[PDB]
Design a protein around this ligand. Structure first.
Ligand SMILES: C[C@@H]1Nc2nc(N)[nH]c(=O)c2N2CN(c3ccc(C[C@H](O)[C@H](O)[C@H](O)CO[C@H]4O[C@H](COP(=O)(O)O[C@@H](CCC(=O)O)C(=O)O)[C@@H](O)[C@H]4O)cc3)[C@H](C)[C@@H]12
Ligand SMILES: C[C@@H]1Nc2nc(N)[nH]c(=O)c2N2CN(c3ccc(C[C@H](O)[C@H](O)[C@H](O)CO[C@H]4O[C@H](COP(=O)(O)O[C@@H](CCC(=O)O)C(=O)O)[C@@H](O)[C@H]4O)cc3)[C@H](C)[C@@H]12
Ligand SMILES: C[C@@H]1Nc2nc(N)[nH]c(=O)c2N2CN(c3ccc(C[C@H](O)[C@H](O)[C@H](O)CO[C@H]4O[C@H](COP(=O)(O)O[C@@H](CCC(=O)O)C(=O)O)[C@@H](O)[C@H]4O)cc3)[C@H](C)[C@@H]12
Ligand SMILES: NC(=O)c1ccc[n+]([C@@H]2O[C@H](COP(=O)([O-])OP(=O)(O)OC[C@H]3O[C@@H](n4cnc5c(N)ncnc54)[C@H](OP(=O)(O)O)[C@@H]3O)[C@@H](O)[C@H]2O)c1
Ligand SMILES: NC(=O)c1ccc[n+]([C@@H]2O[C@H](COP(=O)([O-])OP(=O)(O)OC[C@H]3O[C@@H](n4cnc5c(N)ncnc54)[C@H](OP(=O)(O)O)[C@@H]3O)[C@@H](O)[C@H]2O)c1
Ligand SMILES: NC(=O)c1ccc[n+]([C@@H]2O[C@H](COP(=O)([O-])OP(=O)(O)OC[C@H]3O[C@@H](n4cnc5c(N)ncnc54)[C@H](OP(=O)(O)O)[C@@H]3O)[C@@H](O)[C@H]2O)c1
Lengths: 287, 287, 287
């Protein structure tokens, strides 16, 4: 049976990026829908669970994407709710690539740390977006003491609360309104992630290269000026004075490989659920 | 040349269900359109009749779907009207599974009845959707005395009028607003079909198991709660007292075989027409 | 990798015609979008240039189509504006088949004329549509003195101005309101094209057969009444006395082969740009 991926995008039309990577992940056919909502996705899921039986079931799978993670999560939960008993197919959530990017970034940092981040302070600057929040969740699941930072405490605390509830972790929040406050927030940190919006610097070179406690820095912004000063986006563990740096393009190379590999896994069973935790498990295998 | 199926759906987006079965029926590519109307389908058909010649003409075909039986009929007629001379491709109509599902269910019931239902009362509860309307049509063509029931008389009468004109039969409409009236409507019936929307019970045990006239019951709803109480969805002629029951999965297995078979046939010539008459003929050969 | 074509259509839905020809040109997968604008295409293009690298880049390509050429050109320009350095894929513009049809027609006429039309008068009747405008452009590039005609001088001059700006040529414009005026306009012409809307006659038999200078006539309208009287739509260089005729079906046959061949070329490099000039160069090789 041919491997059929059904792409449910919350934006008006389905992401081209997700189509290419889906085909390179081994889907034989990709059929995409835009404007997917919790109310209309049920009948789409019916088409995946009532059309094939037994051995053939695993050859259909669902990918949920779009530009708004909370909208994607609402659809993803509606997909899982529609399943019952054996009437189910594997599914994946990766709105805007936030799951695969966060998983690649954290997996790379944890590996470079020696395999454990337990008990150590990790700071996520501008952590209030989807990539920062998923990064915070995975770091916290690994035992790091995570501080999720943003320009406003109310928004940072809201992000921490959301991560904490979904992932049953205990991320804390902090307000860092400017470069000075971001530079203070990383003092004593062992791992620093910059998860700011595209094209913005958050942590100048002098604010991390002289902090003895910092082991690893990682930056998800690929567009100059980079989130972290004094690195190149292609850096993938490059040493700077006994610290190691992961730039956005180095992280993004793993993300692509990981995203493709997740797609392939969807067709190996009818029971996969690929959200942050399961995507991160594979990221650690591949990093 | 590759086998190209063009899916013209009257709903806002194309049915996922129909994509899967089209691929499993042997299409090499499926390209789906929503919001198809009699007025806009002509240009779509032009794309299928002016792009290939000779032996390759048959490698493109048209599938018409959606959730409104009358609208699907009008689009399908507009497709046939666009053809002229040898400029045509094979086409199939199966809005909401109407033809392939009704053909499977009616063929199985007629077979279990000994090969004839002529002159006997058949009641289609919630028969105003595509599946109920084609069920009423095929039963009436077998000479059954058909009552097509719905919560409102005007919608039930419009469905009956549509059936009667299309098939040159005389189905009667009835208003059954609730459980009590549905139970009354099946009194004296020999065959009862439940064609209600997904996940609704229409006919509990007490409303059919004590009506001596009832020979066979058939339920199209696969999602619990099932349309008929006291049966299993996998039932395929299972005996309950002196009666036999067909559940949605027992019917559905044949519907899927029928649907896949018709898809493959679309690519074996450029002149096929697959509607109730042809699909029911095939169902009786395979049931 | 699999050859992925991304079809960007300016109409509400993607052309069926372009889907069939795209597959017959060798695309492994076609993913179609409607309602594409200069504003929204950038994100689509990003999906084609950030998902594959190295030799795989050329296995993704873009096709822009739709019924409004000016709209397609605006989208095509926005696609090209998104490329920088090596971050690009091959792209083609063929809204409503106007580039491939005009390229086929002009290539056949120039070939039949002996390979040169320089200095000779060419008249494009009803030349204000996309096929007529592209035909005028390509004839002028060959050195013909081109007169682009229509029922209203302002519209004809606007078409010539558009052609002249885009192709750096000097097409002129004339108003021909009726048969008698079109008959006067072809006097002295060596090549006459009718690019009128479907199902309209523009040039009666007597208006061309008695004009000594006319060498070749070509008509793009395949639906009777044909654009040119006294010929058959299947004519492909058929001799009428000392003149030759190309009917719409002779031209259309080459257009189909040319269109398929252009698609194949899109996957042979990541740098192809198939607009009228490059499409015409291939049309001349294939004529
Ligand atoms: C705009 C996009 N839209 C999306 N949309 C969705 N839905 N999901 C997403 O993830 C994205 N994106 C993902 N993004 C994105 C992801 C990866 C790369 C590229 C990677 O960051 C790496 O830079 C390449 O994979 C490097 O690959 C290069 O190096 C390899 C070997 O050479 P080498 O070992 O000698 O060095 C080759 O494969 C070559 O391609 C760029 C942009 C965009 C920011 C962004
Ligand atoms: C909501 C849907 N929307 C539609 N929409 C459209 N457009 N058309 C349709 O037909 C449908 N549907 C048709 N429906 C529908 C059709 C078939 C089945 C059948 C299921 O797909 C069964 O799960 C398989 O038939 C089981 O298949 C398995 O069991 C069979 C025998 O096992 P066994 O004898 O080994 O024990 C084997 O073929 C195996 O593949 C269910 C629902 C849906 C209720 C319904
Ligand atoms: C309404 C359509 N929509 C479009 N939409 C888009 N986007 N692009 C288009 O080009 C079109 N059209 C293209 N147009 C169009 C295109 C082709 C033909 C038919 C072609 O003209 C035929 O292919 C040749 O006339 C027959 O001759 C050809 O057939 C032979 C091969 O054998 P075979 O094809 O019979 O097998 C070739 O040698 C060649 O001579 C008719 C109309 C339509 C007017 C029009
Ligand atoms: N390589 C890939 O595959 C890929 C995939 C997805 C994302 N990314 C990248 O990952 C990064 C994060 O993505 P995202 O979607 O999570 O980011 P985002 O939501 O766009 O922005 C993240 C946060 O940045 C902060 N921010 C915005 N403007 C700011 C400004 N002027 N000054 C300071 N802070 C500002 C905000 O936090 P506060 O308001 O709380 O201060 C915001 O919540 C981006 O650079 C994106 O390009 C890469
Ligand atoms: N076994 C298979 O192979 C297979 C394949 C295809 C479809 N199906 C199933 O077959 C059934 C019928 O298909 P369909 O397309 O005809 O369904 P449908 O159009 O979705 O709905 C059928 C009818 O159900 C009635 N209805 C809706 N809500 C109701 C409610 N609360 N209470 C009572 N009646 C209600 C309506 O009739 P009124 O408004 O007139 O009362 C409606 O016209 C569905 O359950 C579908 O999932 C099964
Ligand atoms: N073989 C193929 O694959 C293929 C592909 C594309 C197109 N074509 C054919 O090529 C031809 C031209 O296509 P097109 O899209 O460029 O055409 P078009 O835009 O529809 O029409 C061309 C011009 O015809 C003139 N016209 C319209 N109605 C008229 C009327 N009643 N009387 C006189 N003139 C009238 C108009 O010029 P004025 O208003 O300025 O007078 C108009 O700009 C069509 O016949 C089309 O079918 C064939």
């Amino acid at each position: 049976s041919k491997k059929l991926l059904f792409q449910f995008d919350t934006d008006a039309t389905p992401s081209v990026f997700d189509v290419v990577v889906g085909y390179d992940g081994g889907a034989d056919h990709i059929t995409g829908y835009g404007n997917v909502t919790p109310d209309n996705v049920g009948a789409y899921v019916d088409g995946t669970i009532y059309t094939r039986g037994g051995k053939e079931k695993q050859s259909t799978a669902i990918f949920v994407g779009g530009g708004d993670m909370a909208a994607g999560e609402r659809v993803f939960e509606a997909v899982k709710k529609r399943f019952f008993g054996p009437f189910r197919v594997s599914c994946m959530l990766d709105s805007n690539g936030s799951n695969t990017t966060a998983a690649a970034g954290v997996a790379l940092v944890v590996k470079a740390a020696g395999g454990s981040v337990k008990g150590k302070k990790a700071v996520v600057l501008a952590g209030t977006g989807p990539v920062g929040m998923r990064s915070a969740a995975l770091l916290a699941g690994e035992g790091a003491e995570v501080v999720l930072c943003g320009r406003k405490l109310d928004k940072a605390q809201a992000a921490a609360d959301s991560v904490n509830k979904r992932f049953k972790v205990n991320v804390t929040a902090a307000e860092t309104a400017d470069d000075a406050s971001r530079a203070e927030a990383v003092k004593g940190a062992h791992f620093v992630f910059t998860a700011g919006a595209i094209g913005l610097e958050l942590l100048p070179q002098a604010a991390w290269q002289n902090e003895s406690s910092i082991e690893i820095v990682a930056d998800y912004n690929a567009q100059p000026p980079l989130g972290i000063g004094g690195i190149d986006a292609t850096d993938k563990g490059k040493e700077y004075g006994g610290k190691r740096a992961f730039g956005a393009l180095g992280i993004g190379g793993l993300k692509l490989k990981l995203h493709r590999a997740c797609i392939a896994k969807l067709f190996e069973s009818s029971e996969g659920v690929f959200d942050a935790e399961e995507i991160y498990k594979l990221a650690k295998e591949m990093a």
